[PDB]
Structure 1
Amino acid sequence: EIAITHHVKEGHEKADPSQFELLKVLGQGSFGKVFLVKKISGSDARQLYAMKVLKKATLKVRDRVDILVEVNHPFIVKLHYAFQTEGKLYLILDFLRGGDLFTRLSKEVMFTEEDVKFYLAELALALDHLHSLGIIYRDLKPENILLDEEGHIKLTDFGLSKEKKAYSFCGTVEYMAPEVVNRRGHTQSADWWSFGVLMFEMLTGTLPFQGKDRKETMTMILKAKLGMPQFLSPEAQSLLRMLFKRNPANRLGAGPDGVEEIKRHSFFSTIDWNKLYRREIHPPFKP
């Protein structure tokens, strides 16, 4: 069973089925049946959204950590509303025409370092923006990563997990930083570890810390010395080593400059971050 985690923005305006006008019904391939709807009332009145109605899905609602009104970010899709009605979970999301799953692509292609620079660069901008909004992922993973019709990254701003006793947080262990596995407290720097795991997996098609079972994987995340694939460039190896520091205080991205520590790394030296943000760099793969 799926659990959706909604990180609600402060001053969130709770919703229900009656705040939405049905406009269209679409078949969106891997997304299944999607309703195009129009918000009737509130700050976002008249805004068009995608609506998903899930049978048997759990909703978890979490708080995030100047009175600003949010605007779109080029590499994020947002969950604006999530509410339960008669056994059904309604999700109101940014409309994503022709969207697809990153995992669909990753299964089909062999990424080079050049390819990964592009996807990780968009992902870094997205993740940092979520951090600024007060969202901490904990187990950022490929299921959180979509591609738009143009092949650009769309990071979901909501959590997705597969769920005898219920847990408030069900994380995919392979993507969790040591301090998260410890449950002894963590910050946004945990997500940069996960960013490193994503990078490692993109480059190698394997996970860096993987045991026979959750318990062993956890042991490995805490104590396992990572065998760095030698085919990787010095720059790739350097970035991975700096993201996989077990002490979060020493981890790249943990300093006051946060994501800039990553953006400044030699692995990303070819990236023009302003052109990237403007969506003026073409993806390695076009859907």
Structure 2
Amino acid sequence: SMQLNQYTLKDEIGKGSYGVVKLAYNENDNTYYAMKVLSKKKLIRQAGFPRRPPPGCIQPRGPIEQVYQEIAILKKLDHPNVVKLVEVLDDPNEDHLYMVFELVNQGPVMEVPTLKPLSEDQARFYFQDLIKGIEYLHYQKIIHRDIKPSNLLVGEDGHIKIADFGVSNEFKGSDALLSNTVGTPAFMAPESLSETRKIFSGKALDVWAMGVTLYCFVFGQCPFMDERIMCLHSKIKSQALEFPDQPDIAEDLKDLITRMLDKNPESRIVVPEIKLHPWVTR
């Protein structure tokens, strides 16, 4: 192990989009926490080398601003279905940055693909948690942009907390107006995967990813899948949603998933409607 101020840093417990997460023991309050460890120089390099001056896809001028945005976002959020940032350790003369979170004991709910999906009733309990967390994020003008089962941590109490705010965005106004976005390929909405003159809604991207997540919950694999990236993108954009013959799930759950995975973001179900869907309220 190693010492960092009042913390004893132990084994690596997870690895998200950036950095690594260690188990950390706080000697002052005799409590364990989850500590995300980052290198500022590495975060800068992850964005790519800056371009020489020339004579929708422009590199950010100051890539380090994204981690400070993630920190500001996490500081704003206090909800039982969202991770809780408790401290940031950041010396301006050091390259490392540390983010301390309350521990969510059991880790990710699922790592897709799995041969062991959840039952329909357990999927409903976790999905009810997911709705509450996302509705709160959206109310706080935050889009997560990386909703998937491996970013949903199960606590001591059997409830989920949304984690990995590495690519999250805070917007002004009613919704985020995006020209392009980031995400895990199999969870990205069809509108985000074309060359077009049309911007798209950030909140509806989170809904699409919730739809893929819910499908994963009960089936253990994504609805659109291919190892070839061009084929995966083509399927997300043009392949009709299908459900496997087994496990046989309820018709109302198929209705809900179908509405969340509507390829048209204008007609895709919204979170206020998802909350009142018959499968959710049963």
| Fold shared, TM-score > 0.5 on shorter chain | yes
2:267 is the counterpart of 1:250: yes
Alignment TM-score, normalising by the size of structure 2: 0.67
**CA–CA distance in structure 1, aligned partners of residues 230 and 89 of structure 2:** 33
Which residue does the alignment assign to 1:76? 82
Question: Residue 201 of structure 2 aligns to a residue in which SS?
Answer: coil
Alpha-carbon spacing, 1:97–1:118, altered in 2? closer, same or farther (3 Å): closer
- Cα drift, residue 102 of structure 1: 2.0
**CA–CA distance in structure 1, aligned partners of residues 68 and 7 of structure 2:** 30
- Cα drift, residue 214 of structure 1: 1.3
1:129-158 C-alpha deviation (Å, 9 max, x unpaired): 111222213332223211122322010150
Which residue does the alignment assign to 1:273? none
Which residue does the alignment assign to 2:35? 51
The 10-residue stretch of structure 1 (99-108 or 240-249) with the greater mean CA deviation from structure 2:
99-108
Unaligned runs of 5+ in 1: 1-20, 39-47, 162-167, 254-258, 271-287
**CA–CA distance in structure 2, aligned partners of residues 193 and 141 of structure 1:** 10
Q: Is the 8 A contact 1:77 1:93 kept in 2?
A: no
Alpha-carbon spacing, 1:96–1:106, altered in 2? closer, same or farther (3 Å): farther
Question: Residue 138 of structure 1 aligns to a residue in which SS?
Answer: coil
1:47-106 C-alpha deviation (Å, 9 max, x unpaired): x97533246852634869xxxx94621010145758687785423132215342223698
Alpha-carbon spacing, 1:192–1:83, altered in 2? closer, same or farther (3 Å): farther
Alignment TM-score, normalising by the size of structure 1: 0.66
2:233 is the counterpart of 1:233: no
RMSD: 3.5
Question: Residue 6 of structure 2 aligns to a residue in which SS?
Answer: strand
Identity percentage of aligned residues: 28
Amino acid at match of 2:165: F
Which residue does the alignment assign to 1:23? 6
**CA–CA distance in structure 2, aligned partners of residues 160 and 33 of structure 1:** 20
Alpha-carbon spacing, 1:210–1:83, altered in 2? closer, same or farther (3 Å): farther
The count of corresponding residues between Structure 1 and Structure 2 is 226
Which residue does the alignment assign to 1:111? 118
1:188 to 175, 189, 203: 203
Unaligned runs of 5+ in 2: 15-20, 44-63, 169-179
Q: Higher relative contact order by CA 8 Å / sep ≥ 6: 1 or 2?
A: 1
Amino acid at match of 2:249: L
Alpha-carbon spacing, 1:82–1:155, altered in 2? closer, same or farther (3 Å): farther
Alpha-carbon spacing, 1:73–1:110, altered in 2? closer, same or farther (3 Å): same
Alpha-carbon spacing, 1:26–1:105, altered in 2? closer, same or farther (3 Å): farther
1:133 to 135, 140, 147: 140
Alpha-carbon spacing, 1:242–1:35, altered in 2? closer, same or farther (3 Å): same
Amino acid at match of 1:111: L
The 10-residue stretch of structure 1 (23-32 or 213-222) with the greater mean CA deviation from structure 2:
23-32
- Cα drift, residue 176 of structure 1: 0.6
Which residue does the alignment assign to 2:216? 201
Amino acid at match of 1:110: P
Alpha-carbon spacing, 1:130–1:28, altered in 2? closer, same or farther (3 Å): farther
Which residue does the alignment assign to 1:11? none
